[PDB]
Amino acid sequence: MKTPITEAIAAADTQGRFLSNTELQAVDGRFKRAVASMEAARALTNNAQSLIDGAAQAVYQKFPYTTTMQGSQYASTPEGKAKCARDIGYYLRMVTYCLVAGGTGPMDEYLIAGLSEINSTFDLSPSWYIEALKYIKANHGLTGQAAVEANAYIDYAINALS
Amino acid sequence: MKTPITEAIAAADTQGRFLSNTELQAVDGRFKRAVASMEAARALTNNAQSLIDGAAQAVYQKFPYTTTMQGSQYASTPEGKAKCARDIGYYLRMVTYCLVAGGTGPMDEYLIAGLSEINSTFDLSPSWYIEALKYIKANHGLTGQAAVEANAYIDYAINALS
Amino acid sequence: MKTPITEAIAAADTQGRFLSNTELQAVDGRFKRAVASMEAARALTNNAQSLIDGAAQAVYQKFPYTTTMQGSQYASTPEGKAKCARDIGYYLRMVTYCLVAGGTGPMDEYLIAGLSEINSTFDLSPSWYIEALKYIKANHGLTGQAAVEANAYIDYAINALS
Amino acid sequence: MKTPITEAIAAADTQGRFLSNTELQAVDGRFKRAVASMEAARALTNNAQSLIDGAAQAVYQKFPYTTTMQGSQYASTPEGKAKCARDIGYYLRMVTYCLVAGGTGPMDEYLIAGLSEINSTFDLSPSWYIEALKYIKANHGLTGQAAVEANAYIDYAINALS
Amino acid sequence: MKTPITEAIAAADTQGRFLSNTELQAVDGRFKRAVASMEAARALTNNAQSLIDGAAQAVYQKFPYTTTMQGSQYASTPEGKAKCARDIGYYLRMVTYCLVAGGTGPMDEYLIAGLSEINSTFDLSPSWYIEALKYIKANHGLTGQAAVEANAYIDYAINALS
Amino acid sequence: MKTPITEAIAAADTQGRFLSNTELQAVDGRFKRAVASMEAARALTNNAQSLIDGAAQAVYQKFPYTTTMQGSQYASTPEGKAKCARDIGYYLRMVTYCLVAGGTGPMDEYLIAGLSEINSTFDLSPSWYIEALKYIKANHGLTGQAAVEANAYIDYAINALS
Amino acid sequence: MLDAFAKVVAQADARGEFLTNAQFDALSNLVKEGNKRLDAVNRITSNASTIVANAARALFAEQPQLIQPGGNAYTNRRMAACLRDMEIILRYVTYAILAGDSSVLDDRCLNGLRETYQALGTPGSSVAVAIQKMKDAAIAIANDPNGITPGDCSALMSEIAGYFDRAAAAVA
Amino acid sequence: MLDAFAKVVAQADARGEFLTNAQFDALSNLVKEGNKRLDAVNRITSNASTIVANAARALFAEQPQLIQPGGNAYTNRRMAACLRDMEIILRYVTYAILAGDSSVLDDRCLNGLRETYQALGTPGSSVAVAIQKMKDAAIAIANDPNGITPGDCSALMSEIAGYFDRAAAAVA
Amino acid sequence: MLDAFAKVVAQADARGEFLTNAQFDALSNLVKEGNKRLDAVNRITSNASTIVANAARALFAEQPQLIQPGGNAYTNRRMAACLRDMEIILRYVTYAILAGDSSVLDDRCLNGLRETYQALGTPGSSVAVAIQKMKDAAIAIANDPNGITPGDCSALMSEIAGYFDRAAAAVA
Amino acid sequence: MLDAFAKVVAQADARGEFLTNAQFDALSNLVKEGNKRLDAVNRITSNASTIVANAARALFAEQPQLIQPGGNAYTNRRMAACLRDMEIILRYVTYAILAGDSSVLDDRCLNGLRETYQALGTPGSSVAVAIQKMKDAAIAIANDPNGITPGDCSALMSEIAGYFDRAAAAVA
Amino acid sequence: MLDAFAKVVAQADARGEFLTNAQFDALSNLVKEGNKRLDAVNRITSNASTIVANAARALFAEQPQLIQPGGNAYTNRRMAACLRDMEIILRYVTYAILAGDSSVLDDRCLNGLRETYQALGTPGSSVAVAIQKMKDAAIAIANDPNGITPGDCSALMSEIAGYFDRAAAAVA
Amino acid sequence: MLDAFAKVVAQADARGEFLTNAQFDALSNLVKEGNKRLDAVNRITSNASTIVANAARALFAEQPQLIQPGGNAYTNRRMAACLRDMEIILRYVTYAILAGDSSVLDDRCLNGLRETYQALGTPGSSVAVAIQKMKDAAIAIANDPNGITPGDCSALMSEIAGYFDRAAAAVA
Ligand SMILES: *[C@@H](C)[C@H]1/C(=C/c2[nH]c(/C=C3N=C(/C=C4\NC(=O)C(CC)=C4C)C(C)=C\3CCC(=O)O)c(CCC(=O)O)c2C)NC(=O)[C@@H]1C
């Protein structure tokens, strides 16, 4: 999994070298940033449910057809709505994994790999999940560098869907 | 050249990716460490001459034969002594390059690549340069994290010679 | 370009061989089928405009939001509608290229290569173009083996979008 | 084995694709040609013995030395003659395999691969087998497209020996 | 060209090494053998014409059909006979090149490479040239180690034709 | 192991060929040289002890510091002296292996591979072993071609250390 | 790779025999059924994506633990891998339908596939369910009496079923 | 690689146009001449070895310096290389006859071939003679009125000649 | 690859000199501006997709012949290639912003790129327009005064502009 | 490869769960001990060569049959291979110290290493001795109270010992 | 690869010993027999093709089921493969004769060859017959008293037989 | 690669001629001088390292700007590269001495080497000085009258000089 620390080791291991100051400086930056990253992960976790519930509605309001249109890919049934809230929660949970791990690795491995294939096969529009992420970014209530961490990984998701 | 920043870019460029928070945390650690690294580079530069002069003698005292033994590889002639002081200064100057660049790149590219070949061809014993570096490490007069930076790159040289 | 004839040559050329009866039988099947393929290409070309106009509406009726929703990717403006009718015509024209060439080559090279990238970047939903192709398949008015040829390449487009 | 159908599949399988109309047109040409191919295979099989007996003599008349010259590679002994008639029958049987399979695969795999090595090691002259095949081509009594199929694979053998 | 000396260099050059005693011993064996090799080359050159004339007849006697049978590949015409005597002389001249060079290189490069292709295309039977070489081997009149050298390269030709 | 004979076979085996006169001439040169090579190997073996004892002193006289200087890499202790005499004997024994085998293989495989790594890790100066070999070369008492063989492999060791 | 024709050829060659009349007649009836064979391949292939998608949608409805956290088909990487395996199996099955012989499916798809799923933790019994779904869908589509010249394709649909069953039996 | 059909397609696409009737009729007449095209390919291909051999035998008779010591076709290595080049050229020409378009011959055979012979010392003017020999032989064989349904193949033989001339012009 | 720091090192080494105070002070001020540099990289990178898309949408509006049949950006293959080139250029520009030096952009992106577009028929003058669009968008985004600690980043925005201009000048 | 943080992430994901407070607090205390972890890695790494050399010198003193003729570490090729294996093991151990997790050491060093030594004739019991020597030396060096801010690193030294023991147990 | 000389060297080294007189005398007698060894290699090699061909001709006479339809040596592909295996075995045997040691034959020819024939269906017992034929022919040729300096080569012919038997024993 | 013998062979073949007596006598005198040729190769090769080192030591004494900061031979990477080039040139020269022909040196060392040094900034005029130094040293060593059977090697030393001059002329 791609974290600042596994990148440091990967770099050294690729060249057949012991670690050096070059790499330890990189891990120190991960350890220092961790303060702001944890603060964000803890806040997003504590407010996860209202953020998922809020994000799901932002989608249904932006894209009303997804609640009235017939089809197993839409949220026009109780099951559809459940699947959607489920997916939004998956995205939110991956953001907190990235904050805790200090990199994109968790989202890369668990969500982004295969994403475009899944969205095509099941006829899921990326516009939906972008809007859900855009809503979380606006209403997570984070300030300072904690917001910068959170937005960096939410915007990372958004670029994967664009 | 191998610095914390070119490693960050190399990592991203290798995978065909934009930079991510994973990499920016690494550069932040380089920028934070720079305070201690610069302090050391400035001090080693300001006291370079007495350190070179002191280190050269530590060698001649440890290895007296290098001043009395006949041969173009020894410091038994004015030219030999000049070449030796020159080489010690090269090592000291590379340490300060590594501190300024934030990594081993300068020493790797300008000194370590080819080192063993050069020491074999011209019959230069690594024991000599280790002793010179050991002397600099003991008498650079650095405290705190500045000493840790300096010693990390001097000990890096020593491992290349061992 | 991938046609029954270039596949025959490619096969022989790959192995360093002259053509053989194995390959000539394949071209004969292309020449025999051409009767039905041409009939379809000529009919789809002769009725192209009403099919494009009909297909565009099937989309706007199936997906009404694409005509009322704000955004440069939707057909909520005269330009948007023009772009859409343009795209539907591109799909129809590729079907006739495939019928004339006797294979998928034209559509593969001019439309399918890059398709998923284009639909993601400009936020164009594949569901739209599938519905347009589904409408053309139902209302091209072709019978017998001419219909089988036409449907084979329209359904080929649909699988590329699924 | 190389048949029109395994070439179609090979082509698709090489590119990681389902079959397409491009390939099915090729198999249709194999299925249509099969009428003429079978007619030839059935006739060559029904008259195989007189064709083998006739072909063997055409050789001994064209190359009389092969019946009078001493050596295990010649037909100057009852065993030699048996081996020769055997070989001519092998060639005739491969022609009928190619007609039934619709391609060169049978002859390629069972006879042509290794042919030049075998003819060198055992001192068998290709001129002999060409003359035997030339005789079969002239006296198989086939007309129309059945003759075209038969001659295509007999001439295919001849080119392998030239 | 493959000689004992170019093999020695090739070996060293392949491994990135200076020559060593391992290789010089090999060249010494070439220089010592040269006495016997030259003696043979000089004798075969001095008696080349009677050997070519004798060898050509051994062929026509062994294979009488090659003088009476119609075809541009046979010696049934003045031109055919000229081509044959020419070819036999080519073989004899290559044997002397191998003796002078101390290896197979000359024959490998000028005659053996392409041999089987040429004999197939122009319908030239290897049995002919084997008989010509067999005659030269029996009537070159060489004794001792000179004969051993000559026979080693004539038998080398024969194996290339078998 | 690299001997004149395994090089001959290696050459043939690399190209997929039987041996040829090209290679047998090389082995003959090994068999002829063996006279002088054996004479040297037998003499160096018979006088090994006085040569080792003499060579060890040449080193301690040339490099007196190796007997007075503290450190496990020096001969300033009974164990150190034992290790040194041991190493000199290893070099002498490899020279006799090379003479018996007719090539560098024994020394290449048992001593040279890894040499520079070992001399660096244990802080053993190549100058020492060169002087020991230089002494053996001057006092082995060999004349004629036996001396040429011995010196070829001693100078081969010296180049590996330079 | 062998098709129905090369299959007979390779058996006659092993015996050193010309073909008999029983074989020339059997191979003629393949040809006479070739149109039907091409309709089936064309139909299954033109609906490849819906066959796969609908099969997966049903599989995950019936076995929702495959998509729960920890499930073998959880995360998009493993879901995509699963949908791919279903695409691949269907692709090699359509190859076999065109060839009249299972060798392509055996040699290039099914051989070693049981060992692959065992080494990965993938339940082949669930992959078999998936293959069963595709089968019923492919046969329903290929034997649809609509928009085609009426006739009897029952023997062909038995053959097509045979390949699906073969693949399903090789993973379980 | 383009055949006659893909050629028209790629021109219409560059213009963004459906095909006109003048194009649908022209492409139909190719199809109606397809049998003749297959007879020519089959005939030239079934006599590939005699076309090449007899062409070489004549070339070397007319230009015996190519086979004298020092000649570019002296030694069996260079003779084989020469016979091969003749095989290769003929092979790509028969490809073009089947495709109705020279692109395969141009892209995969003739492009850069003049520069190759110049860098090797091979006289392309003699290679052109060789290609001329094969041409006359291939046309004589392909247009043989014997053992075939009578008809007019003159336009096809002009096309076939066009490819041989094209190759001959590209090496000289 | 060189960053701003390695750049100075490599110049001092060429002279055989320790660093002077003018250099130790200059390299300290880079560090003191490092936060701003990371905000710019983060901001441009977090909006990579909208920077590219909106830039293309404007390019094709202004130059609609690039998307007409025959145009260099017509068909999805060439459109995707164009969008990719824009992604790639932007990616190497953000690399340069982090390094404080253009060497990565020069060595790995811009060197030889003019010759590439010339050999393909791509109008580099239109690629320059594209790069100009991204520039204005990236600077507007990176220098947005909102949601960040107030301060002066003008020197940094001049540097960022320098890289975009450099790339735009190398293709035209 | 997993570090201490990714380890927790991958366990929560398998359960489909957000992290609990017990996990957010545990991962915060890793960070708060990060300085100590970097001192240990730096110290062991800065003395890599003396750790290895002195360990070998002791190993061969205690087991002189490894360097006698016929011994597994006799000749410079096998001695160098032995010193290398010791370098490699130490390198992957320092990787694990930085990551807070043994996965890199397991996956890339220790897995299959027992089988390698068995197939070569190398006594893993002697390799374990070597690893034991390096361990005591590395801990003595890394926990040296001199020239560092005083504090308690005992838990870290237990962890570091754990990795050495793990490697030693995997070869024996 | 080891020759007779390197063999002794590698045994002395394993013991850490100089060579004794018993070894210097034994290695001198190899040299003194070197001419005979070169005559044998030269003779077998100069008749490689007749040794192989005549051996096969006899094998197939005695075991005609190997060449009947279905036989392992039926078809030209398998016949050529068989003749090749016979060429290869003979080639590695002549290598061993020159080296005075079987290691080249063992390591590069015979090792794993029994498993190869078992996995292919080739009867190694018939391959052994083939190797037996070549043996008698090679010895008859190599020990021919004609056209050579008279002398005793009996020990050499026993050695040569040893290699053939070794190969024959390794496939059966 | 050609040696002195293959050289004559390739000239006779181009003419289609047997060798004349003038050629059989010339090639016999090479053989009769073979011992001297082997002494020269052995002597130069046994002193390769001192030839190179002493040559470099003198080169850098005479041209100290090559080792000053900025010099082409400054840093250990470029010094090692320089010493290597000197090793390589000397190695290919000794090859030529053994072969009696410069082709190996030309084809595998000197061809394109002038262009290489020009593209790198290396002054070939200084490389020529280096080659001149090695030449004088190699000839002094190879023609040393000590410890060898007395005789005249002057023609050989002229040849050896010819190769050094050839290499020196090809870089300048
Ligand atoms: C110019 C681009 C605009 C601007 C930038 C700005 N930022 C600061 C302060 C900070 N910026 C960061 C950002 C990061 N540090 C990291 O390690 C990473 C990657 C993980 C990032 C993205 C931080 C941590 C700070 C310090 C904390 C803070 O919020 O201040 C300043 C003030 C100067 C300074 O360096 O501190 C400025 C000016 N502000 C503007 O008005 C410009 C439009």
Q: Would you spell out the secondary-structure blueprint of this structure?
A:
The complex is a heterododecamer, with six copies of chain A (162 residues) and six copies of chain G (172 residues).
Chain A lengths: L3 H12 L5 H26 L1 H15 L2 H4 L9 H24 L3 H8 L2 H7 L4 H14 L4 H17 L2
Chain G lengths: L3 H12 L5 H12 L1 H13 L1 H15 L13 H24 L3 H8 L2 H8 L3 H19 L11 H18 L1
Bound molecules: phycocyanobilin.
PDB class: photosynthesis
Keywords: Phycocyanin, Pink beam
Assembly: dodecameric
Order of helices and strands of chain G: HHHHHHHHH
Termini separation of chain A comes to: 23 Å
Q: SSE order of chain A in H/E notation? A: HHHHHHHHH
User: Architecture of chain A in CATH?
Assistant: Orthogonal Bundle
Please outline the major beta sheet of chain G. none
Strand content of chain A: under 5%
- In CATH, the topology of chain G is named Globin-like
What is the CATH C-level name of chain A? Mainly Alpha
Number of separate domains of chain A: 1
Q: What's the helix count of chain A?
A: 9
Q: Give the largest chain-chain interface (CB within 8 Å).
A: A-J, 34 and 31 residues
Spell out the CATH superfamily of chain A. Answer: Phycocyanins
Largest sheet of chain A: none
Find the count of extended strands of chain A (DSSP E, 2+ residues).
0
Gap between N and C termini of chain G: 25 Å
* Oligomeric composition of the shown chains: heterododecamer
Shape, per Cα inertia axes of chain A: elongated
Globally, the shape of chain G reads flat
Q: Structural class per helix/strand content of chain A?
A: mainly alpha
- Helix proportion range of chain G: over 70%
Instruction: Write down the Rg of chain G.
Output: 18 Å
Main location (chains G, H, I, J, K, L): membrane
Function (chains G, H, I, J, K, L): Light-harvesting photosynthetic bile pigment-protein from the phycobiliprotein complex (phycobilisome, PBS). Phycocyanin is the major phycobiliprotein in the PBS rod.
Subcellular location (chains G, H, I, J, K, L): Cellular thylakoid membrane
Binding site for (2R,3E)-phycocyanobilin 1 (chains G, H, I, J, K, L): 82
